[PDB]
Design a protein around this ligand. Sequence first.
Ligand SMILES: *[C@@H]1O[C@H](CO)[C@@H](O)[C@H](O)[C@H]1NC(C)=O
Ligand SMILES: *[C@@H]1O[C@H](CO)[C@@H](O)[C@H](O)[C@H]1NC(C)=O
Length: 383
Amino acid sequence: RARVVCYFSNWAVYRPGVGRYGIEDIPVDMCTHIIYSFIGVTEDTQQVLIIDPELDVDKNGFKNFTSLRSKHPGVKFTVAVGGWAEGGSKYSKMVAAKSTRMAFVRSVVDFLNKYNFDGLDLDWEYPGAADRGGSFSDKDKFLYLVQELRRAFIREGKGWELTAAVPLANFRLMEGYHVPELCQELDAIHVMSYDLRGNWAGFADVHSPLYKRPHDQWAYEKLNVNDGLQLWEDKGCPTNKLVVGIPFYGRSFTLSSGNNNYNLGTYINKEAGGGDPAPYTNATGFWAYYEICTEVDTADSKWTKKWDEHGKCPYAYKGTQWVGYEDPRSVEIKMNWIKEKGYLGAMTWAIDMDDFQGLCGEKNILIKLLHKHMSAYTVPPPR
Ligand SMILES: *[C@@H]1O[C@H](CO)[C@@H](O)[C@H](O)[C@H]1NC(C)=O
Ligand SMILES: *[C@@H]1O[C@H](CO)[C@@H](O)[C@H](O)[C@H]1NC(C)=O
């Protein structure tokens, strides 16, 4: 009764060569809930914004995705609104008044009906975040949006789910999230237990450490997956609503000039913006799992791979380049820990970055680990 929640990126179809990943590449039976990412909100009218209408509507992307249920009927297919590229300001604007929230809610209900989705995942990054166009009143008004969406979903009578992707840093929680009230209205809380470190922090480190390391101090002291999920529990979310995110990508860095120390916490060249872009994702500071394994795991690789003994995550480096990520060892350790803690299940950002071509020898290796572990696991009653 555990969940395996798979985010699917609608832009991965534009990656070149073996990076191209479309609806037809989703390994549907490895997931229990699959989430088409992203739609947005319009700035002026507070309606659903279709972000790639040529793909999502003209080439039938949304409907090909939802019509996957014909052959896979036990899986739920929902849509996510928001995401990082959307920004936060349009969402703060949309929730600022009852009238604008109701315009959005109506728009969402029409959309979910039009494309036969099973519900909505909220991915506003983030209510209350000054760095993302937010402000103080977002905390109350996001809860109002959630309560209003749930009521609309009940009125529609189709049993749609409402879920949200959430951060784990305490300051983000305090600024944006009425935890007990939200966890009561939502079917699942998809915890973004990743991007916990990265170029923005000014030092090299793995980005999904499971436990605290000695170098973790002040706002990093509890910024790890174990303590972050414990914070969600402490603030009032039931264990059986929490789904733990697992990144199928690495955060990379360019090390500072003449720096020969490759340990966790080593200084970086922050102005570089991260490690150099990889060939398929073409994004500074961000490498898909398949981009990492094809470089690090080959027999004649010149990368050096190490292990964070406390964070339980791999990292690898070569030259000035350093990347922290998840591999099968670390993902196994996290699946066992989810079961130990009794959480609702596992989530992946994102299924389009697993080694779905088997470039490294084993097709869909990471999602197969999530599926193997979760499908044999019974979620216990709340703690
Ligand atoms: C949807 O499926 C049709 C029929 O197979 C295909 O031609 C089309 O390219 C698909 N569109 C997307 C976005 O996957
Ligand atoms: C990679 O993205 C950069 C922006 O960072 C863009 O300028 C460049 O054209 C892209 N290259 C490819 C091959 O997509």
